[model samples]
Target: DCLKFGWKCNPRNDKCCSGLKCGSNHNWCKLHL
Candidate 1:
């Protein structure tokens, strides 16, 4: 399953939900726009 906004995630092994991306600064899922 994909991660939601504000959820902790890894850029290598985790995937964020649609329109969201794994942030490098906090390692959390955040909106791209």
Candidate 2:
């Protein structure tokens, strides 16, 4: 939920990704519409 810790969710709801955890730096979960 926080970018500081690198916590994010998938916009496309794609599981098994590296950005679905609480410690990732991916744009797929950082994009906010």
Candidate 3:
């Protein structure tokens, strides 16, 4: 499953959807502006 904005994520074990990116704080997914 793809991570959403503000969702919990991992830099080495997870990935966010096309609209979001993983690594906001090295643990959360962030959405593009």
Candidate 4:
């Protein structure tokens, strides 16, 4: 049986980073966000 983790990706506001190239506010990779 395959079990999957119930982890959801929480995206941050577009401007939350404030001039940072990092897209996601949660500090994750932009591609992942």
By lDDT, the best candidate is 1
User: lDDT tens string, model 2, 1-33?
Assistant: 233223444534533334333323463334332
Candidate 1 similarity to native, TM-score: 0.73
Task: Choose the strongest candidate by TM-score.
Answer: 1
Runs in model 3 deviating more than 4 A are none
lDDT of 4 by residue, 1-33 (tens): 211122233444332232233334444324322
Q: Rank the candidate models, highest TM-score first.
A: 1, 3, 2, 4
TM-score of each: 0.73, 0.17, 0.59, 0.14
Flag regions of model 4 displaced more than 4 Å. Answer: 1-16, 23-33
Residues forming the 10-long window of minimal summed lDDT in candidate 1: 10-19
Ranking by lDDT: 1, 3, 2, 4
Prediction RMSDs, each to the true structure:
1.4, 8.6, 2.2, 11.5
The alpha-carbon root-mean-square deviation between model 3 and the true structure, to one decimal in Å, is 2.2
The segments of candidate 2 whose C-alpha lies over 4 angstroms from its true place after superposition are: 1-7, 14-33
What is candidate 1's lDDT per residue for 1-33, written digit by digit as tens?
889999999977558998998987778999976
Residue 12, candidate 4: Cα error in Å is 12
TM-score for candidate 2: 0.17
Instruction: Compare candidates 3 and 4 on lDDT and give the better one.
Output: 3
